[PDB]
């Protein structure tokens, strides 16, 4: 490896009783092979909870719905970590993993 967590721009652009905690819960388990230039946005919608939308620099790559009465929040946080890199895995990480250390965990 010989690498350090130097880059990053995770901002608490979140204003919901669940979406404010998604910021902290995501960043507590966040890890990445790319430059890590991502931020977390939410839209509060009292019909159901919050929309969560993660953006890399200025571009959306993953988004999902959070619910405050349900217990999926932890699972939805952990799943957003994988789904954030799965957007970038065919954009740019594809050349890095092909050049040295192809995948062997979950192809399809």
Curated annotation (Swiss-Prot):
GO BP annotations, alphabetical order: curli assembly; protein secretion by the type VIII secretion system; protein transmembrane transport; single-species biofilm formation
Domain of life: Bacteria
GO molecular function, one term: identical protein binding
Key words of the record: Signal
GO annotations of cellular component type: cell outer membrane; curli secretion complex
Keyword check for NAD: no
Biological function: May be involved in the biogenesis of curli organelles.
Protein name as catalogued: Curli production assembly/transport component CsgE
